[PDB]
Ligand binder design. Structure first.
Ligand SMILES: Nc1ncnc2c1ncn2[C@@H]1O[C@H](COP(=O)(O)OP(=O)(O)NP(=O)(O)O)[C@@H](O)[C@H]1O
Ligand SMILES: [Mg+2]
Length: 302
């Protein structure tokens, strides 16, 4: 539920990243009932001392969101400085840096699986009437080669370069809906297909608005099939109502996972030596981030 200071340690020297609206630090979680150490990531939001009943209401609502493809929120704590959101630390990093690093060895099965698992988590969020508002590969974490998790969800009432994932209607009026998440999901899939290159690379803001207003979309990658590109295209409809829901998108990509090399050209497939090398890289990142304080199995046993 609510974590006190006696159970949390914020490593202010282990800054994980910048953030649109809040920095993230590595940390260790000490459950008082159990001498077990849990490597965690601590996101710090300092928002005008807004320690109100509304912030507690949306902290527990976000805490009850449970799904295998959602990053588990271990707990929360509200301070005078602001709000800290604690999540389980993932040594592999976000999907954006993960796609670039493993561009040459990730297979077509892994790419369709990421789109499927992300669509699986978004379906749970949609059924919970929760708008993510910031869906992208940078906000998707990699647990292992065949398992990704969505993070930074449910920050609507809690409160940039994300224009590349912004639907057309958001430019005119601010109305973050589930249909706008479907748009960002289409761009998110495009990142996975292109192994994490930047959308609208030869462009800039706000020319993207008129580029999308003139009916243009992101070009089909050379490795993307036509049946898969039509899915991204229908994620980018002009009318917000004409776009499919994550209920439809979940059933589509699940059928795509049956034969993944039928929708993406990828000569590479994951090797069992890379599975063992991935396990060695996770223990290394755990040993370095916490200076041997965290036993690597403690994270694996979790
Ligand atoms: N639970 C976690 N485990 C491991 N790394 C994490 C975790 N949460 C966040 N990170 C990393 O910490 C960084 C902080 O990201 P974040 O502060 O959310 O901003 P962002 O994802 O870059 N974009 P934005 O949130 O819109 O400002 C990210 O680059 C992640 O790679
Ligand atoms: Mg983020």
């Amino acid at each position: 539920c609510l974590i006190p200071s006696s159970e949390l340690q914020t490593k202010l020297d282990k800054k994980l990243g910048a953030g649109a609206f809040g920095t993230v630090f590595a940390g260790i979680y000490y459950p008082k009932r159990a001498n077990v150490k849990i490597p965690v990531a601590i996101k710090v939001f300092q928002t005008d001392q807004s320690q109100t009943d509304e912030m507690l209401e949306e902290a527990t609502n976000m805490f009850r969101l449970r799904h295998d493809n959602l990053l588990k929120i271990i707990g929360f704590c509200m301070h005078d400085d602001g709000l800290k959101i604690v999540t389980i630390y993932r040594p592999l990093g976000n999907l954006q840096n993960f796609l670039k690093l493993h561009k040459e060895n990730l297979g077509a099965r892994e790419q369709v699986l990421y789109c499927y698992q992300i669509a699986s988590g978004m379906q749970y969020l949609e059924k919970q009437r929760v708008v993510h508002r910031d869906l992208a590969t940078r906000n998707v974490l990699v647990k292992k080669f065949n398992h990704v998790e969505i993070t930074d969800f449910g920050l609507s009432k809690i409160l940039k370069v994300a224009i590349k994932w912004l639907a057309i209607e958001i430019f005119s009026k601010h109305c973050y809906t589930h249909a706008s998440d479907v748009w960002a999901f289409g761009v998110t899939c495009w990142e996975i297909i292109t192994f994490g290159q930047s959308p609208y690379q030869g462009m800039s803001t706000d020319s993207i608005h008129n580029f999308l207003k003139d009916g243009n979309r992101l070009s089909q990658p050379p490795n993307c099939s036509q049946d898969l590109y039509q899915e991204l295209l229908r994620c980018w409809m002009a009318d917000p109502k004409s776009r499919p829901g994550f209920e439809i998108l979940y059933e589509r990509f699940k059928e795509f996972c049956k034969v993944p090399q039928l929708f993406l050209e990828n000569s590479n497939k994951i090797s069992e030596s890379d599975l063992s090398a991935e396990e060695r890289f996770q223990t290394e990142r755990i040993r370095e981030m916490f200076d041997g304080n965290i036993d690597p199995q403690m994270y694996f046993d979790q």
